[model samples]
Target: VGRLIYTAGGYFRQSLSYLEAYNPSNGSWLRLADLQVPRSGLAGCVVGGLLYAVGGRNNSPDGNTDSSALDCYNPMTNQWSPCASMSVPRNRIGVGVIDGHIYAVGGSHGCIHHSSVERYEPERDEWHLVAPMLTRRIGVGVAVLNRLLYAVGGFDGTNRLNSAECYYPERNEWRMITPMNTIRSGAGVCVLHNCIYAAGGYDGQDQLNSVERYDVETETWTFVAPMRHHRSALGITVHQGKIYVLGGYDGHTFLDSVECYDPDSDTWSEVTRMTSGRSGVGVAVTMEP
Candidate 1:
């Protein structure tokens, strides 16, 4: 139904041409404007008519050298601008927006996993510290619904995790949620029709093809059809009721392939491959004006 349902690039190295867009209608790809700064393991989300790209590793593995830089892009104007830096420099973090504010959750800061949480109030053009997450994690997935934030599976340096947490903006605190059945990291998550869907990731030992659904109301998870290929660090989003999985790595090589999950049929179908192979990229669906 749209030209490009998903897009990825930027997470590995600083390279502008790394950006690519995916069309689900016929499974094709097109290139988009490159990010001003090439980076991998970054977190991205759309809020207040702009795409905000958050912290990431900047050409180094030294945790102390990671960049806490935050950049915002205006799709309509094809321009990028700087924003407030994060309190802590992180990579592989989960990002989402609640009530028009950007929430940056758990991530790795080089030495160890971080439980720090911060909120960006765009209106005030400032960021403020908030109650941290219960667990320290990286490569986690985050989504928002009904004003509450949900953060799911990721790595804790030593092991993959299945724990999940929910944030309450009203109280400025976090509470534990039902954990995933499978412990994994670098998974993609999205909210569709009130249910949160988590897709392919690594389970520490091997790449995964499994997909699971979490019912927010019941706080329960049920198994669903798995993806055609094992993938991690993929980008997932729901557009017009169909879930789209974008570029990710399968252990050996980065992937350009795409897949779609149809909740009604409880099945997955292969779609068009991406223009470029990318890992640890961000994906989001632009809402209609």
Candidate 2:
């Protein structure tokens, strides 16, 4: 990954298929190839130097539908091509890359919560079912740390969750990890300096600006400095020793502002805003310039 940050389909009004890349070096954004299908609440990640836009759904006000498609984007060619579809249609799913494979965790099928999990292998272009998580989740935040895939808080149909868990690929099993201090649905998650940071989400009653960090070695969760704005369903990525959280919903309105976190100082500062408000955005970073 060079220095560009790519954001795929997300909800602005309905589902959006527009793809765009931001050059932090110059503080500019360039439009890219659109996805084959428009989707919202999708999961985006980089694998084998390729950017992937995973399952989400059409955010139609009247009748929404789920998408199981896995779209791969090649930066060299600036094109998006279809890959293997997931077994279950998922919206608001969480995804993380581990050992060259992508693991997709809990999301929902319309109103039904899914506890099931799946893994995708690029060379074979295949996706196989893996061990399910202990709880069904939607809008879960996932990140990889120390070769382990961590599935953080999300809405589990009935309640916003503070519980968290991790998956071990070798054993093909998942076990509960330290829960966060706050119940978070649609939190923005990323790993920084061997610690997993979960930031800004909905806590059922209100959007949260609260943030927390998890230490795997200590098996504990601790409160961290909060963001300036309360947000949920946001996009997060780490670059140059800082965590950048992108546009998301802030209870009353959609947001276009971006915030950056520095672990060394345990603080967050404002960054350049986006062109427009975006919620449920899929964010990924590619090193290729």
Candidate 3:
């Protein structure tokens, strides 16, 4: 039923693909549209019907090594348009939306890790600074539930961390949450039925297949079934009662494998693999209008 649409032949820097919708019921792949500019290590989130692609490394490896470019894509129109740029050019940041606004948190600009946070208002087409994060990190995963945004584990340049933090928009402040049991970076994160799940990332020496769940109500982390293959820079989203983990690198090679995790059954199963192997791709469920 899922249709996977992605670029087949292109350099990650010269060209990058956009969200591809897959109908799991039909088993088909459709390319929606492409980004305004080519980038790698970017973060994406869906707000209403629009998909926002935030900061990453641009085509240039030096001049714009880390980019602040922000663009939006409309699947209905199959087009791309410029939005507000982030204050700090960053890559591998954590992105999520809460209360109708987009939030981009902790990422790095080359060798330096960032604790900065920025908010984007589509109505105004501008970005505003928010409260900073407790820890400087990059390659983090973000998820939101009940108006609070959670930033999960990632690297701080020196070492991978198990730390997690949450931000309350109403209070305009950030606070620490229970850390993951395993230290990792570049993992995929999503929330489903009140539980936040984090899966698959690098733990410094090797790629990981470990999965962990965080209970917002109890503020605790629990171990879960792991994936078949270890990977990092993976894309994860919750859709139709299942968690879908898309393309990522398995340390030695980029992968096109897609796996699904079902919490109700406590199992990990392989779904349809993508046609193209890509690391650092963005994954999102079909946005609602």
Candidate 4:
């Protein structure tokens, strides 16, 4: 049983913790519980039937340093609670969850990008160091599919990147994969029909509206329909088998605009806008076991 898919914590000039729930009936967003600590560049995942907001920075100028604080939201209860702190602080990280276990992927430790990945076991309330990414990246779009973790485009210390990689659960190792056709650090990504879709992002020069999909079988990427708006630092969630693209910066302005992509139609169209514009939001779909 899954419902109340939403996004929280993002920013433009400052960090935010505003939350919005997708109302499919009206194709709009509804107000929900706000994060206790507003932040951006954060990572989030659903585990044990709840949404967890992991390490991220707030409205501080040094937000790149990150927060070790972990907060979980109980949608059914309409409440929020603090969880165990991560082993180390991070911002702009990727997230993956399997069987209720949490994985914190690579992110930044200040301006320097990181290659470190951490795993959290709730039974022990602990986080453990695990296999690192081949490249140090921040602003990446990550998703878990087919029992594997996929990390997509992001920025390194030197340049905006177009590379991609995947993690094997058994081996606990990451391998490089064919990169996306466009550089899309901070783009939103999700898996549908076993295909990994990479949506709008920044390409070093400007915000982008293009989208692409990765064919795991072919180990190659193919172009898909472009989004209605160019965005970066956005969050993506797959709901009812459709990909929902949330808010982000559009080069000149922070955006509250929302869009959805239908795999069957191979097209993207605008949806109801959010209450406010934000970038770097954390998104998740609520699914019950």
Q: Relative to the true structure, how large is the alpha-carbon lDDT of every model?
A: 0.77, 0.89, 0.79, 0.83
TM-scores for every predicted model? 0.91, 0.97, 0.91, 0.93
- Alpha carbon deviation, residue 178, candidate 3 (Å): 1.3
Roughly what TM-score does model 3 have, to 2 decimal places? 0.91
lDDT of 1 by residue, 55-82 (tens): 7665534322455777876666666688
Q: How far out, in Å, is residue 181 in model 3?
A: 0.3
Best by lDDT: 2
lDDT of 3 by residue, 57-107 (tens): 755554556778788777668777888789998788778988789898888
Which residue pairs clash in candidate 1?
Answer: 11-39, 11-40, 12-40, 14-38, 27-272
Prediction 4 global C-alpha lDDT: 0.83
Give candidate 2's TM-score. 0.97
Name the best candidate (by TM-score): 2
Model 1 CA lDDT for position 155: 85
lDDT per residue, candidate 2, 16-110, as tens digits? 88788887787888888988888989989998779999999987767688988899999999889999999989999999998899998889997
**Clash pairs of candidate 4?**
none
lDDT of 4 by residue, 1-289 (tens): 3375678888867787687777766565677778988889897788877888987788656644478777888877878899888777778888888666888877776676888888888778788889889998888788888888888988888888899999997999999999888888888878988789988888989889998999899988999889989988888888887888888888888888888888899988787788888888898877421
Locate the minimum summed-lDDT window of 10 residues in model 4.
Answer: 59-68
